[PDB]
Design an enzyme around this catalytic site. Sequence first.
Site, PDB file in Angstrom:
ATOM      1  N   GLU A 148       0.815  -1.197   0.000  1.00 32.96           N
ATOM      2  CA  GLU A 148       0.000   0.000   0.000  1.00 32.96           C
ATOM      3  C   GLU A 148       0.853   1.251   0.000  1.00 32.96           C
ATOM      4  O   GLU A 148       0.718   2.099  -0.864  1.00 32.96           O
ATOM      5  CB  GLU A 148      -0.890   0.016   1.216  1.00 32.96           C
ATOM      6  CG  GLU A 148      -1.700   1.273   1.348  1.00 32.96           C
ATOM      7  CD  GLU A 148      -2.409   1.345   2.673  1.00 32.96           C
ATOM      8  OE1 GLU A 148      -2.501   0.281   3.333  1.00 32.96           O
ATOM      9  OE2 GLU A 148      -2.897   2.448   3.058  1.00 32.96           O
TER      10      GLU A 148
ATOM     11  N   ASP B 132      -0.892  -5.102   3.218  1.00 35.24           N
ATOM     12  CA  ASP B 132      -1.409  -3.907   3.852  1.00 35.24           C
ATOM     13  C   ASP B 132      -0.904  -3.962   5.285  1.00 35.24           C
ATOM     14  O   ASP B 132      -1.266  -4.857   6.053  1.00 35.24           O
ATOM     15  CB  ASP B 132      -2.944  -3.872   3.809  1.00 35.24           C
ATOM     16  CG  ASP B 132      -3.514  -2.525   4.242  1.00 35.24           C
ATOM     17  OD1 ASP B 132      -2.807  -1.792   4.957  1.00 35.24           O
ATOM     18  OD2 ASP B 132      -4.657  -2.177   3.862  1.00 35.24           O
TER      19      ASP B 132
ATOM     20  N   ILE C  40      -0.791  -1.906   7.997  1.00 33.07           N
ATOM     21  CA  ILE C  40      -1.811  -1.648   8.995  1.00 33.07           C
ATOM     22  C   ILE C  40      -3.034  -1.339   8.186  1.00 33.07           C
ATOM     23  O   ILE C  40      -2.973  -0.527   7.246  1.00 33.07           O
ATOM     24  CB  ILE C  40      -1.498  -0.425   9.856  1.00 33.07           C
ATOM     25  CG1 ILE C  40      -0.133  -0.592  10.502  1.00 33.07           C
ATOM     26  CG2 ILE C  40      -2.556  -0.263  10.949  1.00 33.07           C
ATOM     27  CD1 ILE C  40       0.217   0.523  11.451  1.00 33.07           C
ATOM     28  N   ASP C  41      -4.013  -2.219   8.327  1.00 32.17           N
ATOM     29  CA  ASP C  41      -5.322  -2.057   7.726  1.00 32.17           C
ATOM     30  C   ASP C  41      -6.264  -1.490   8.781  1.00 32.17           C
ATOM     31  O   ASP C  41      -6.641  -2.182   9.712  1.00 32.17           O
ATOM     32  CB  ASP C  41      -5.813  -3.414   7.229  1.00 32.17           C
ATOM     33  CG  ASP C  41      -7.106  -3.318   6.457  1.00 32.17           C
ATOM     34  OD1 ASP C  41      -7.142  -2.664   5.398  1.00 32.17           O
ATOM     35  OD2 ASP C  41      -8.083  -3.938   6.888  1.00 32.17           O
TER      36      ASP C  41
ATOM     37  N   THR D 268      -5.714   2.307   9.719  1.00 35.42           N
ATOM     38  CA  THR D 268      -4.830   3.329  10.283  1.00 35.42           C
ATOM     39  C   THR D 268      -5.578   4.325  11.156  1.00 35.42           C
ATOM     40  O   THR D 268      -5.073   4.719  12.199  1.00 35.42           O
ATOM     41  CB  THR D 268      -4.093   4.101   9.191  1.00 35.42           C
ATOM     42  OG1 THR D 268      -3.460   3.172   8.297  1.00 35.42           O
ATOM     43  CG2 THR D 268      -3.045   4.992   9.798  1.00 35.42           C
TER      44      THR D 268
ATOM     45  N   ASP E 258      -6.294  -4.193   0.492  1.00 30.51           N
ATOM     46  CA  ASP E 258      -7.386  -4.266   1.458  1.00 30.51           C
ATOM     47  C   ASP E 258      -8.013  -5.645   1.562  1.00 30.51           C
ATOM     48  O   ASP E 258      -8.340  -6.115   2.650  1.00 30.51           O
ATOM     49  CB  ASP E 258      -8.461  -3.262   1.083  1.00 30.51           C
ATOM     50  CG  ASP E 258      -7.995  -1.862   1.256  1.00 30.51           C
ATOM     51  OD1 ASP E 258      -7.302  -1.619   2.261  1.00 30.51           O
ATOM     52  OD2 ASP E 258      -8.267  -1.014   0.380  1.00 30.51           O
TER      53      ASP E 258
HETATM   54 CL    CL Z   1      -5.681   1.519   5.270  1.00 34.01          CL
HETATM   55 MN    MN Z   2      -3.151   0.423   5.349  1.00 32.40          MN
HETATM   56 MN    MN Z   3      -6.619  -0.848   4.100  1.00 32.96          MN
HETATM   57 MN    MN Z   4      -4.446   3.911   4.481  1.00 34.85          MN
END
Ligand code: CL
Ligand code: MN
Ligand code: MN
Ligand code: MN
Lengths: 272, 266
Positions: free
Chosen positions: B66, B86, B88-89, B91, B216
Amino acid sequence: WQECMDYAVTLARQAGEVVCEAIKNEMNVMLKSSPVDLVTATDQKVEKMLISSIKEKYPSHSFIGEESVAAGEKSILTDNPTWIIDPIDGTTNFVHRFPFVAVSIGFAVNKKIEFGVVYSCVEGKMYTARKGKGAFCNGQKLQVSQQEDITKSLLVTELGSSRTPETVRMVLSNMEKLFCIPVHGIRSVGTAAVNMCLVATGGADAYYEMGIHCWDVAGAGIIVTEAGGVLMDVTGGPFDLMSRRVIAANNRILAERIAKEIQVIPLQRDDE
Amino acid sequence: WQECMDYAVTLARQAGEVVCEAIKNEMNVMLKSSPVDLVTATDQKVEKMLISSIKEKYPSHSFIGEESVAAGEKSILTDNPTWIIDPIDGTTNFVHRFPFVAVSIGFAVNKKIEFGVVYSCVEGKMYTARKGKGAFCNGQKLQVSQQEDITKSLLVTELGSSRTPETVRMVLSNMEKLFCIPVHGIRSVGTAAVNMCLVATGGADAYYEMGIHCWDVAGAGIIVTEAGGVLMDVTGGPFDLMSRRVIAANNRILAERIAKEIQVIP
Ligand SMILES: [Cl-]
Ligand SMILES: [Mn+2]
Ligand SMILES: [Mn+2]
Ligand SMILES: [Mn+2]
Ligand SMILES: [Cl-]
Ligand SMILES: [Mn+2]
Ligand SMILES: [Mn+2]
Ligand SMILES: [Mn+2]
């Protein structure tokens, strides 16, 4: 009062043991107000236990209870030590196994909340709060967030069980108004008691909702305020337990702002 | 493939551990493409610490990540073993200490997700799936719900980070259409990946969102389908990684019922 409260925490853990045992199994899902207002045998079972159990040691005390009121009892509140009980908060969650159901208990005397116990059994989290003696999750002391910038806020709210079109209209609009300040986001985990405990931890900056009943927020509110937060009416008025409207926030600044932006939804109170 | 997998899972438990020490510290927060579109230093550090440890063992492999796509690199997918990260999904949850933040990793080969790993770290829940081999959270096998009645279903969705008024209106309007079907309720915990894993478990029946990305949905997706569920485009048509819009439901009945009801945002 520590007698009364120390008992509640123990009762809360039992009820909780029941509910999260029930959540694994076959459910008996009935209706209340509508096709969406749900209840199970477990809701009733728990409420009854909580009441007989309290009433037994304190036959002096009164009880407001979600399902008791629903079998024709009355939510008039007085200066008698009342116990305000939601036996399962998040009944739709419970029915779905969406993993946030809370047992909420709130003690009132003279129409003020002394202490509240909210037990989130899936989480294994017990939140407590005595007036003047702080708020805790599982023995650990809680504090609300320091944020006062509405535009760096995380909010929680619910859409409500109502599907009356003119109400859903108003609901989503109020959300849109707040979302377009902008705020950082909005969450809904499914239960007022927990949406409010999350505000107490400072995981979220503010919770607000119109449509709630006194038993939804009797317990969680003193935890928020004791975590150093604040409660208010959506009018900017001081919080009214029976108003069916609540803003629960980290501070007066954030509370004041959410109050300004949203429109007051028509609902009839618990004292009428 | 199972070596790449068990590898990812260690990577993930490890990045999650960084993420979850970090969370409980004050942070400098930085914006990207809007004033609510956030990143902090940890999204970046964790991602590097992920990409580097993989290519340092798998140097033949392509990556989609990402934050790296942000600071420059290119979001094009080939048939070469591709890791899709990703870091940190969630944030905004992370920045807020809202307790749903996940590390996510999808491994596609020939543009096909072979396995997924999604670690929701505050929760201590390590979700994993392998095409053919099923879905698990913490060693316990996962299976979506059985509900085929949209009127008895609980949906999870997300309001988005777009504050573009017409984008916004279409979000709430779709939400209103579904809400009024009526459905039992709609929920948001703040992260596509956990939202989709909650569907894998049966705690929720479908999840829909327009405006998501590769990273994601690249780990949770296989987790949903391996627990019995289906992925779909919001258009009722087929789902591919690059589509930017998904429906993850327990079954097609429900997915198509949702598709019928929501207007596709462009
Ligand atoms: Cl995110
Ligand atoms: Mn993220
Ligand atoms: Mn995400
Ligand atoms: Mn983000
Ligand atoms: Cl309820
Ligand atoms: Mn209830
Ligand atoms: Mn309730
Ligand atoms: Mn109820």
